[PDB]
Amino acid sequence: SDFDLIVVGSGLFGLTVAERAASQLGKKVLIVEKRSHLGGNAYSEAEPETGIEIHKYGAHLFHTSNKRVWDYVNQFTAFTGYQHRVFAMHNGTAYQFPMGLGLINQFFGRYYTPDEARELIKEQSAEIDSKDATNLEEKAISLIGRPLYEAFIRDYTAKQWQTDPKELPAGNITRLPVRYNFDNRYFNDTYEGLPVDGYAQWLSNMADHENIEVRLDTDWFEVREDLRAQNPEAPVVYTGPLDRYFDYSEGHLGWRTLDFETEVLNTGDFQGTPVMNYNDAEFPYTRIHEFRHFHPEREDRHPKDKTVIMKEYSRFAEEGDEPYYPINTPSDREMLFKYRELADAETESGKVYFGGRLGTYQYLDMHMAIASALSMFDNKLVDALK
Amino acid sequence: SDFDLIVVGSGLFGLTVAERAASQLGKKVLIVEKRSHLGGNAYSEAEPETGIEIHKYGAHLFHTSNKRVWDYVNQFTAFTGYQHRVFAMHNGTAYQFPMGLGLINQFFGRYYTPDEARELIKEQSAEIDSKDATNLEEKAISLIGRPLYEAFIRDYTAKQWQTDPKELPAGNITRLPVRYNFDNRYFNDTYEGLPVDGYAQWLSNMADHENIEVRLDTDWFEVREDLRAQNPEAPVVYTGPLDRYFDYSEGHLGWRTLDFETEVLNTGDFQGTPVMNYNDAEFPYTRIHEFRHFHPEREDRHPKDKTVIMKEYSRFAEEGDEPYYPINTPSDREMLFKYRELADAETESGKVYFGGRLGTYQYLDMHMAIASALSMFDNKLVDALK
Ligand SMILES: Cc1cc2c(cc1C)N(C[C@H](O)[C@H](O)[C@H](O)COP(=O)(O)OP(=O)(O)OC[C@H]1O[C@@H](n3cnc4c(N)ncnc43)[C@H](O)[C@@H]1O)c1[nH]c(=O)[nH]c(=O)c1N2
Numbered sequence: 001s002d003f004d005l006i007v008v009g010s011g012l013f014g015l016t017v018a019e020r021a022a023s024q025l026g027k028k029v030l031i032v033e034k035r036s037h038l039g040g041n042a043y044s045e046a047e048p049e050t051g052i053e054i055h056k057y058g059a060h061l062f063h064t065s066n067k068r069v070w071d072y073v074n075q076f077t078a079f080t081g082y083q084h085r086v087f088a089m090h091n092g093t094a095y096q097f098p099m100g101l102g103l104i105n106q107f108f109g110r111y112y113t114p115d116e117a118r119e120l121i122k123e124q125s126a127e128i129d130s131k132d133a134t135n136l137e138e139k140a141i142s143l144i145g146r147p148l149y150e151a152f153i154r155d156y157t158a159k160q161w162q163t164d165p166k167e168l169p170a171g172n173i174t175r176l177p178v179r180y181n182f183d184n185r186y187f188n189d190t191y192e193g194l195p196v197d198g199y200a201q202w203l204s205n206m207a208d209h210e211n212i213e214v215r216l217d218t219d220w221f222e223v224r225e226d227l228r229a230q231n232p233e234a235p236v237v238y239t240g241p242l243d244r245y246f247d248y249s250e251g252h253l254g255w256r257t258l259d260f261e262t263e264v265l266n267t268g269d270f271q272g273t274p275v276m277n278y279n280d281a282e283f284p285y286t287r288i289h290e291f292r293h294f295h296p297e298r299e300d301r302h303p304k305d306k307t308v309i310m311k312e313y314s315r316f317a318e319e320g321d322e323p324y325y326p327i328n329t330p331s332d333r334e335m336l337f338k339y340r341e342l343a344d345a346e347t348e349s350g351k352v353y354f355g356g357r358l359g360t361y362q363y364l365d366m367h368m369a370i371a372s373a374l375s376m377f378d379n380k381l382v383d384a385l386k
Numbered sequence: 387s388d389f390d391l392i393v394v395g396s397g398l399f400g401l402t403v404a405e406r407a408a409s410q411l412g413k414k415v416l417i418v419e420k421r422s423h424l425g426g427n428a429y430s431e432a433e434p435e436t437g438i439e440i441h442k443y444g445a446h447l448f449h450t451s452n453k454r455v456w457d458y459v460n461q462f463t464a465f466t467g468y469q470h471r472v473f474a475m476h477n478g479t480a481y482q483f484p485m486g487l488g489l490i491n492q493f494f495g496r497y498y499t500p501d502e503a504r505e506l507i508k509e510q511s512a513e514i515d516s517k518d519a520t521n522l523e524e525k526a527i528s529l530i531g532r533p534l535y536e537a538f539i540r541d542y543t544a545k546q547w548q549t550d551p552k553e554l555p556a557g558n559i560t561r562l563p564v565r566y567n568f569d570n571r572y573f574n575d576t577y578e579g580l581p582v583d584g585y586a587q588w589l590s591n592m593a594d595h596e597n598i599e600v601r602l603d604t605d606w607f608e609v610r611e612d613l614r615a616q617n618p619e620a621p622v623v624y625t626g627p628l629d630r631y632f633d634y635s636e637g638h639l640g641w642r643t644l645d646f647e648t649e650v651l652n653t654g655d656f657q658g659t660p661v662m663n664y665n666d667a668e669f670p671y672t673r674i675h676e677f678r679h680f681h682p683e684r685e686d687r688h689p690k691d692k693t694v695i696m697k698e699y700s701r702f703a704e705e706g707d708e709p710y711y712p713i714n715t716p717s718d719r720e721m722l723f724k725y726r727e728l729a730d731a732e733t734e735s736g737k738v739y740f741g742g743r744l745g746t747y748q749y750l751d752m753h754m755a756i757a758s759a760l761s762m763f764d765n766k767l768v769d770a771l772k
Pocket residue numbers: 008009010011012013014032033034035039040041042057058059060061062063218219220221239240241258324325355356357358364365366367369
C-alpha cells in the first residue's frame with residue numbers, strides 16, 4: 001500500500017502516534033491536516049517585523065515530571081534552561097507570584113517568616129471552613145481569606161470565565177494556593193524548558209521521517225471516502241473535534257475561546273518579564289505576554305528597539321471561534337458520555353481511534369497529550385497494525 | 387621515586403594541579419595538607435544534629451562561563467540545577483535583589499516599566515556625576531542616587547569593611563548595579579549549580595587517584611627538609627600563605643576575616659530562602675544563610691522540624707584569624723610586589739611554584755582558581771616534569 005495508517009490532525013497527539021508507527025513499526029503513515037501548518041495549537045512562527053517567535057494559539061511553556069515523555073521529546077529537539085515565572089499586577093504594583101512569602105510581604109506590608117505566614121493564613125482564612133463552602137468565592141476565602149481572594153482571584157477568575165465567582169462550583173479549588181517560602185518557580189515539575197529552535201522546528205522534526213507523508217490544507221471529511229478506498233483497512237487515528245465527527249448528532253460541545261490582540265511596540269522592553277497577569281477588573285485582558293523574554297538567549301538576534309506583545313482575552317466560543325478550553329457544564333458531560341459510545345462503536349465498526357484534546361474533549365498539557373498518544377500507540381495501535 | 391611532585395595545600399588549586407599531574411602526565415603526587423580535611427575553604431560537612439550540609443569557610447556557590455573549567459569539574463562531580471537568588475532585608479521588609487524592577491517597585495511604591503525605571507534612575511542619580519566622585523559614598527550616589535544608596539548600600543558596605551563609605555576609594559564601584567527587568571538570578575554566568583553529593587565528596591574525588599598520596603594534618607614547614615631530601619628535584623607547588631613562606635621578612639599581608647555564628651533552630655524553615663542579606667545597621671551580621679535551602683532536592687532526608695542557620699560577621703584579621711579576603715591598602719600591594727620577586731627567585735632557585743588564593747594574595751572564585759591551576763599546569767609544570 002501507499003500508507004498503513006492515516007492520522008487526522010498534526011498536533012502533538014497525531015504527531016506522536018505518527019512518529020511511533022513510522023520509526024517503531026516501520027509503517028507508512030499518511031498525516032492529513034486541515035490548517036496550513038504542522039503542529040496544531042503548539043505551533044509558533046516569527047512575527048514578520050521583528051523576527052521574534054510568537055505562539056498564535058496561546059503561550060506554550062513545556063514542563064514535565066514524566067521521564068519517558070522527556071526522553072522522547074529530546075529525540076526531536078533540545079530545550080533551553082528557561083524557568084517560567086509570573087508576576088501579578090494589582091493596584092499599580094507588580095506582585096511576586098504565585099502566593100508565597102514574596103507576595104505576602106508586598107501586600108500585607110512587612111516580612112513574615114514561614115511560620116509567621118502559616119499563622120497569618122490560618123486567621124485570614126478561618127472565616128469559612130472548607131467543608132461548608134458552596135461556590136467558588138466561598139471555597140477560596142475558606143482557604144486564603146477575603147483580602148487575598150478579593151485582590152488576586154476575584155476579578156481574574158471572573159474575567160477568565162465571564163461569570164461571578166459566587167456562581168461557580170466550589171469544586172474548582174482543591175488545594176491551598178500558598179507557599180510558605182520565597183520560591184517563585186511557576187511550575188513544580190522535574191523537567192522544564194523551551195524548544196531551542198522554536199516549536200515549529202520541533203514539531204516538524206517529528207514528521208520528518210522517510211515513512212511519513214503530510215498533506216497540509218486538507219480537511220479529513222472532504223477526502224475520507226477517497227483515501228480509505230485506496231487501502232480499506234488501514235486504521236485511522238482521528239484527533240479532530242469529537243462532536244463534529246458525528247455531525248453534532250448529539251448536540252454541540254461547549255468550549256471557551258481566546259482572543260489575542262498582538263501589537264508591535266517601539267520599545268526594546270515593555271514589561272521586562274515574559275508574562276504579566278492583570279488581576280484588576282479595570283483591564284479587559286487577563287494577561288500580557290512579551291515574547292522576546294521567552295528566549296533571552298537570542299537577544300542579539302532580537303530587535304534592540306521593538307518588542308512584540310500580546311494581550312489575552314477570554315469569552316465563550318461561538319461558531320468558527322477556535323475551541324481552547326472545555327467548559328464541562330453537566331449539560332456538556334452528558335452528551336460527551338453518549339459520544340464516547342458512538343466512538344467506541346465506530347472504533348470496532350470502522351477501525352477509527354479517537355485521541356488528543358479535540359477528539360476526546362479534554363484539556364491536555366503537551367506532555368499529557370504526548371503521554372496519551374504513547375499510551376494509545378502501545379496499547380491500541382501496535383495490535384491494530386499486524 | 388615515591389613521588390614526582392609535591393603539592394602544599396589541598397584546596398581547589400592544589401587539587402587541580404595534583405589531578406592533572408597524576409592523570410595526564412602519570413606522575414606520582416604527594417599532597418601535604420595542614421588541616422584535618424581535604425578541600426581548603428571550599429570544604430563542607432554535615433552539621434551533626436540535623437545532617438544538613440554546611441560550609442564552614444563561608445557559603446560556596448559554583449558558577450562559571452568557562453566551558454573548559456565546567457567540563458573538567460564534571461569529571462569529578464555532577465551539579466544540581468540550583469540557581470542562586472538573594473533577598474535583601476531593610477526596615478522589616480524582604481526586598482527582591484539585586485536592584486531591578488522588582489526592588490524598584492517595592493521601594494518607590496508602584497511599578498515602573500523598564501523605560502520608566504531608566505528614567506527614574508537618571509533623575510535619582512544626576513546629583514553627582516560619576517567622573518567628579520572622590521570616595522565610595524559619592525561614586526554610588528552618582529550611579530544610583532541617595533535614597534537607594536542609603537537604604538541598600540550604606541550600612542551593608544560599612545558592616546562588611548568596618549569603615550564609613552566616605553572613607554573608601556571611589557574605584558570600588560565600576561558599573562551600574564541596576565537591572566531594568568524582573569530577572570533576579572544572582573549570577574550572570576552560563577553554568578551554575580551545587581555539587582550533588584556536596585563539596586567534600588567532589589573534592590575527595592579529585593584526589594582519589596592511584597598516583598596521588600595525601601597526608602592530612604601535616605604542616606609543610608615542619609616536613610619540607612625531610613621530604614625534599616627523599617627526591618631532591620621533585621618540584622613543589624606551594625599554595626599556602628605567601629608572606630609566611632618567606633617568614634614575613636617583608637611584613638604582614640593584610641586580610642579581612644569572617645566570623646560565623648551557627649545555630650540549630652527548632653523550626654523546619656527560618657526564612658524560606660537560602661540567603662537573606664541584612665542591610666540595616668541595627669544588625670551586627672551582613673547576612674544569614676539557611677543551608678537546607680541550598681539543596682531542596684534533599685528535603686526528604688532533611689529534618690522536618692529543625693534547620694541550621696548561620697550568621698556572617700566581618701572584621702579585620704588578626705593573628706590566627708582565618709584569612710578570607712585581601713584588603714589591598716597601597717601599604718599592602720607594595721610588600722606584595724617585593725614578595726613576588728622573592729617568589730620568582732625561589733621558583734628558579736628551588737623549583738617552588740606559588741599558586742592559589744593564599745600563595746598569590748588574590749581573591750579567586752572557585753572556577754577562577756581552577757582555571758589558574760590549569761593554566762599553571764599547562765604553561766609551567768608540564769615542562770618542569772620531563
Ligand atoms: C491557550 C492554551 C495554552 C496552552 C495550551 C493549550 C491552550 C488551549 N497547551 C496545551 C497544548 O495546546 C495541547 O497539549 C496540544 O494542543 C494537544 O495537541 P493535540 O494533538 O491534542 O491537539 P491540537 O489541537 O494541537 O491538534 C489537532 C490538529 O488537528 C487539526 N484538525 C482538526 N480537525 C481536522 C480535520 N477535520 N481534518 C484535518 N485536520 C484537522 C487541527 O487543525 C490541528 O492542527 C499547553 N500545554 C502545556 O503543556 N504548556 C503550556 O504552556 C500550554 N499552553
